[PDB]
Write a protein that binds this ligand. Sequence first.
Ligand SMILES: NC/C=C(\CCCCCN)SC[C@H]1O[C@@H](n2cnc3c(N)ncnc32)[C@H](O)[C@@H]1O
Ligand SMILES: NC/C=C(\CCCCCN)SC[C@H]1O[C@@H](n2cnc3c(N)ncnc32)[C@H](O)[C@@H]1O
Lengths: 281, 281
Amino acid sequence: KKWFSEFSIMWPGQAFSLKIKKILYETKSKYQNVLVFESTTYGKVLVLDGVIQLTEKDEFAYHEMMTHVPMTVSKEPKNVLVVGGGDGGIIRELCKYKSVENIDICEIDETVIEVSKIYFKNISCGYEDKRVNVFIEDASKFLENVTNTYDVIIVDSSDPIGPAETLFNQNFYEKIYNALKPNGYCVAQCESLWIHVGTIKNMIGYAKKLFKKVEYANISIPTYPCGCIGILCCSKTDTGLTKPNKKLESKEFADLKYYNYENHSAAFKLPAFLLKEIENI
Amino acid sequence: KKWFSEFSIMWPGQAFSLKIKKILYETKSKYQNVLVFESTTYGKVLVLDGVIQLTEKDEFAYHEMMTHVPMTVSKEPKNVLVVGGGDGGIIRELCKYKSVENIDICEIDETVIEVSKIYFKNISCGYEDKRVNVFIEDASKFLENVTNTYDVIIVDSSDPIGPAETLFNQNFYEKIYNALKPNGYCVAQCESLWIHVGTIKNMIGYAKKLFKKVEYANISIPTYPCGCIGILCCSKTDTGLTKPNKKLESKEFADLKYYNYENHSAAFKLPAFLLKEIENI
Ligand SMILES: NC/C=C(\CCCCCN)SC[C@H]1O[C@@H](n2cnc3c(N)ncnc32)[C@H](O)[C@@H]1O
Ligand SMILES: NC/C=C(\CCCCCN)SC[C@H]1O[C@@H](n2cnc3c(N)ncnc32)[C@H](O)[C@@H]1O
């Protein structure tokens, strides 16, 4: 059996590898190289431009924290935007909320959606929900043109090198701010505290120019570089996103594997070195 | 430049790799294969039997959490035992406490100590402290023969495959219980929640047979498998180890890079799936 190895200039001098049971699908889409394989111990794996996007074994950690942090704080979220997220993980978690009336998703690469529907049925199941509306477009452009405002925006993007380049700048955060309701919230994929402090500082700086409360949370997930990835958390009120307003007690949430009421707040308790780096932004 | 890759049957189907700037030292000791190299991005790395023991870039996460969790809960710790810990990381953190009167360390492999003194001077600096007493012995035997009792025991061991095999059983926890003061605490290296739930359940079961309060905490550290490692936390009172009794405010602690008052308690807030697995032990 051969091994898949994840290299990037975004994490120089380190690599994570997974043993390949079998390769399932490969293509070059309009935007990126796509690889799907069954790993020996992590289930099926989606790879975009050589970077692990998700695995079956651990995706719930990232999808549950990204979704349930803002969705338990927002009082009565009706309209939600997912930026990126073609795999459907975020949408799957959002559909658990009966109060949600509309879920828009803006994914740049339609190939990702169709690959997820074929190879990852338990992740992409949310596309069958009638509330879900799909837009195939660079979210940077979508957000410039949208007429609606949202209660929650979830930026489920890949890394700043690649198609997600347009999502890691000041202008993007202006577009997010404007596309949110006066009491709206945004959470965004915001990299690893172990290797990406420069990016984290930059992103916090962008968010603070517009949002009155900007916070950072950490998620444990073994198949992202350094075994963790952060959530940049953006609020227009000053109460912020650290404290949930509701408990997820209905039958739809009985299946949760990572998120709970207590670890919501725990995720925001950061290592000393990180607090020091971000204090004067 | 070549790469070092970490394989083990303890984590099948996955591997973490570090690019090698230069190899510094290799030997087969009485107990294990020893490798020291300068990595390109993680500083110097100590490898025992092909398993990463520490790197300069991140060791503070594990050494600070392992030490300061029990040491901020124990009221006036005077006598502390470190089991394993030849590298000196735990001892370095313990020496910051002026109230400590004695630190015993029982390391099986004297080669590890001497390698750390040569190649890792900023980790092994605690050996110069006059309170430190070194024992070269299997801790399983040391703990059977010791006459003293301790306020805190820190089990800084490697994995159950290898010399640390004697430290992952019921009899060992009996020896720990007996070697502790009536209000003593023990913390022990207890593997990754992402891949080692069987071991975690077993270890909790062993501890619960003797300790009235058994708790589990998680540490983010990129160079241990799955990017995290747990602390098994053992108390003879029922108050447990989740809440520190003191703040580390003196000049000796100004340098802390991970541990703080808030993340002490946060470390014990575990993912939903783990809580479910351990609930009926
Ligand atoms: N749910 C795990 C997925 C991600 C998280 C992976 C994190 C990786 C950590 N190393 S990335 C999700 C999506 O972001 C999409 N995307 C990238 N750029 C844009 C854009 N400009 N507009 C819209 N969608 C975009 C990608 O095509 C990808 O399908
Ligand atoms: N501080 C990071 C170190 C460790 C943590 C590494 C975790 C690795 C995660 N994969 S292991 C520390 C020590 O435990 C010692 N040791 C192993 N078995 C025994 C024993 N029976 N008695 C005494 N000492 C022992 C090893 O020789 C090693 O030097």
